[PDB]
Design a protein around this ligand. Sequence first.
Ligand SMILES: O=C(O)C1=C[C@H](O)[C@@H](OS(=O)(=O)O)[C@H](O[C@H]2[C@H](O)[C@@H](NS(=O)(=O)O)[C@@H](O[C@H]3[C@H](O)[C@@H](OS(=O)(=O)O)[C@H](O[C@H]4[C@H](O)[C@@H](NS(=O)(=O)O)[C@@H](O)O[C@@H]4COS(=O)(=O)O)O[C@H]3C(=O)O)O[C@@H]2COS(=O)(=O)O)O1
Length: 124
Amino acid sequence: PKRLYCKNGGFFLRIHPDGRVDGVREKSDPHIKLQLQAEERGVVSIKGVSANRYLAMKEDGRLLASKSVTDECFFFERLESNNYNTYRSRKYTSWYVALKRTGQYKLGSKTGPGQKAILFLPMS
Ligand SMILES: O=C(O)C1=C[C@H](O)[C@@H](OS(=O)(=O)O)[C@H](O[C@H]2[C@H](O)[C@@H](NS(=O)(=O)O)[C@@H](O[C@H]3[C@H](O)[C@@H](OS(=O)(=O)O)[C@H](O[C@H]4[C@H](O)[C@@H](NS(=O)(=O)O)[C@@H](O)O[C@@H]4COS(=O)(=O)O)O[C@H]3C(=O)O)O[C@@H]2COS(=O)(=O)O)O1
């Protein structure tokens, strides 16, 4: 039951109950409560507690939430400097979960390992 705080702008990842994924700056938003469950060492599924959906990365680079687990719902969790974590798609292996400075999700296809947009600070 954490909250993923993105370094690019200062937005918390959010998972809405309709499938839409985005960021907010309000820390009391109930849709920013997440549950990361490891499938093994280094691989996690990220689910939005309220919405009961998993974060998924689609083939066009989009981020959305799906009610059931698909091979687009898994990500390698890797620790970066200063305790920030990054989540890279186990399917689209060079694409990273990320948020643009405006709060809207960045397409995984436009991401890369040195961007600030992929860095998340996990908070209870
Ligand atoms: O593909 C594009 O759409 C795209 C690519 C190019 O990079 C650039 O287009 S170009 O024609 O000018 O070459 C333009 O880049 C965008 C970039 O896509 C945006 N990233 S997003 O917010 O995720 O959408 C954004 O970048 C800003 C972000 O905060 C961040 O980008 S990223 O790392 O997450 O990809 C990045 O942050 C800088 C930071 O500001 C620096 N801090 S300092 O105070 O200035 O010293 C420093 O710490 O470095 C980081 C990361 O290093 S980097 O920037 O050198 O890679 O950059 C931010 C920024 O540049 O605004 O905006 C750029 C520019 O967009 S603009 O609207 O044209 O201004 O689009």
